[PDB]
Design a protein around this ligand. Structure first.
Ligand SMILES: Nc1ncnc2c1c(OC(F)F)nn2[C@@H]1O[C@H](COS(=O)(=O)NC(=O)[C@@H](N)Cc2ccc(O)cc2)[C@@H](O)[C@H]1O
Ligand SMILES: Nc1ncnc2c1c(OC(F)F)nn2[C@@H]1O[C@H](COS(=O)(=O)NC(=O)[C@@H](N)Cc2ccc(O)cc2)[C@@H](O)[C@H]1O
Ligand SMILES: [Cl-]
Ligand SMILES: [Mg+2]
Ligand SMILES: [Mg+2]
Lengths: 352, 348
């Protein structure tokens, strides 16, 4: 009993570790993630969002699957409404009133994205920062003392900017603040897209500079590609798209036969549809011979390169399953009259 | 009647007194407009608690502040504690920075600034009272200027572009620029080494279409004593320290430019006594009382005043002006322990 209780505990951490890594395109030190799973408390994870218009399905549907996997494995998750960051980054022409409306719309979508809200929080940056402004801004100032300008300009990607354009001082303040959020929120796991990893590597550098041994674990998820080959409004599906809009965008999306690399249609099947249902039921023509079910990811790869999966069949299955997962969101913005007028209000905004 | 004619008399008199502080006031005509809107203008200067107080920040500041406050203005001493930490002063130790700040207040209250129209404000304390307004302003300023434009303000921190440029060197001038608006400052009265960030604040007004623009009233920099601790006189120097540093100081004959000894006589001693009594042996020219700066300058450039004679009187005058400060830190026990504490601090 005394020995058997140790063996089950070790295998318990091993399986929790392995399926947390399954949703990560890359993890900065899986050995550190195992150490954090051995602590008798829940791990704090977070992702941050600039309210700058309609919601990408990666931020609604893809996020719901990741947060569900983390909260079922001893983690709590924070949605960070980066309102002040969107203002600093000139989103919505910097209009703070519009940013807050888009933030409220994001929370309305997330609340009906099929997530489990028992261990999930929605926190607003400006609210939390002004609750403890001495601690927060002292962190920001101490981070600015630690890195030079060129080191910080390597984080431009986290705000969708580049060195080719005019670099405003806000592009130095922004990554200092995002880096400070990681410690301000006492985050254990930084669960953001790979486009944010530069500033998360910075936070780990800051721990070694300041001799902080509680370094955050970076658990970056891959970026869902654009629908067109080599990746405006038709580049991805959004949470408010209708059943007709999804079918139209998927129909003209890039889906090369017998090839899965850079295939956004297949990428939707692997990252969105499959983890939602834990299977993929490929329905086909009325008599040609379809309605087949898959169960793991490895057999999905082997059969698309095999030719048993036609492009029109994969696209129509992807488009159909995307519409099923989006229907709880459409139903909420149809029956709940207050959210319906909220959606109509933010759709009249001009995307900057 | 003739009561309107005496109104321009009062305004033009205050104009002349205030404009005498700076050699290049940014638009004197705007200053006259501010005085007609209200007499109680708000002036400020800001200080990093980074060690012992330079006499420019004590004896020279007192000359400037009392000129402004006697004309109905308010003067804010901005004890820039967070800026000193951001600039790596006192090894960034905030507890020692606060200690130096308290010592700065004790010097100022004993060298002519214990008065109702002077306020001692701490940066961290005031920012934390209205943090949403302050930091929103810092962020909006950062959105309005690019990196190269902000790196021009490096001089306000005592840095240069040839050294390693940290991100704190971008945040610092954003926060100093915000202070001008946060404090509702009418007149920025700082040394000319701070002028570039004040010009930035006026650019920010034109970008934001803000009509209330600050007037920049920058005073000249006292040159350094050398051509460390000996490159300047400090408010806590003893008589022997002042005499030693003056004697070994730079004082080129016939040349007043970059002359710290002549600068102390012209900017500190002459305004304090409305004269300069040059004590000399008869064979060296004999005692002479200077009533104007024009004759003082003419005599020095023509060789009538040898540098040794100027040094001896300047050192004697500096020691007489530091006497209220010394008596305060010698007699007041709590001020004595404060100075003794900050003396053993290492500078960085
Ligand atoms: N196609 C895709 N596939 C997979 N993941 C994707 C996307 C995508 O597409 C996009 F164009 F909409 N975004 N994301 C991910 O969603 C989240 C928000 O996105 S964001 O608004 O851009 N956030 C920022 O810019 C961050 N500086 C905001 C921020 C601020 C302070 C913090 O303390 C933490 C974060 C981040 O995690 C992103 O990685
Ligand atoms: N030799 C001299 N002759 C004539 N004036 C002199 C000096 C001298 O010598 C020196 F080395 F000690 N300082 N000053 C003047 O004293 C004051 C404070 O000086 S400081 O501590 O350096 N503060 C800074 O630099 C400022 N960025 C701090 C600051 C921060 C936020 C604000 O909202 C405003 C200001 C400023 O007005 C300076 O011009
Ligand atoms: Cl506030
Ligand atoms: Mg007072
Ligand atoms: Mg004599």
């Amino acid at each position: 009993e005394k020995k058997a209780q140790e063996e089950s505990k070790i295998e318990d951490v091993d399986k929790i570790l392995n399926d947390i890594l399954s949703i990560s395109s890359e993890c900065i030190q899986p050995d550190e993630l195992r150490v954090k799973l051995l602590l008798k408390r829940k791990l704090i994870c977070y992702d941050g969002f600039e309210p700058s218009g309609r919601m990408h399905i990666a931020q609604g549907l893809l996020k719901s699957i990741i947060v569900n996997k983390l909260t079922s494995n001893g983690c709590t998750f924070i949605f960070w409404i980066a309102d002040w960051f969107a203002h600093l980054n000139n989103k919505m022409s910097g209009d703070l009133k519009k940013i807050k409306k888009v933030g409220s719309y994001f929370i309305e979508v997330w609340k009906s994205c099929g997530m489990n809200m028992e261990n999930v929080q929605f926190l607003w940056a400006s609210e939390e920062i002004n609750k403890k402004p001495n601690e927060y801004w002292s962190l920001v100032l101490d981070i600015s003392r630690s890195f030079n300008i060129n080191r910080m300009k390597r984080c431009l990607k986290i705000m969708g900017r580049s060195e080719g354009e005019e670099n405003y001082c806000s592009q130095i303040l922004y990554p200092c603040m995002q880096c400070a959020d990681i410690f301000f929120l006492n985050v254990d796991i930084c669960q953001l897209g790979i486009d944010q990893r530069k500033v998360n590597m910075l936070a780990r550098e800051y721990c070694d500079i300041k001799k902080i041994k509680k370094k955050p674990v970076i658990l970056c998820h891959g970026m869902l590609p654009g629908l067109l080959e080599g990746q405006d409004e038709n580049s991805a599906i959004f949470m408010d798209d209708s059943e007709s809009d999804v079918n139209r965008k998927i129909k003209k999306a890039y889906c090369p036969p017998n090839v899965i690399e850079n295939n956004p249609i297949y990428a939707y099947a692997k990252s969105i549809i499959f983890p939602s249902y834990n299977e993929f039921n490929l329905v086909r023509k009325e008599k040609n011979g379809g309605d087949k079910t898959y169960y793991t990811l490895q057999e999905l790869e082997h059969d698309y390169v095999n030719g048993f999966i036609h492009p029109l069949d994969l696209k129509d299955n992807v488009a159909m399953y995307i519409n099923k997962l989006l229907q709880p969101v459409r139903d909420h913005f149809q029956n709940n009259i207050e959210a319906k007028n909220l959606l109509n209000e933010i759709k009249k905004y001009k995307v900057t």
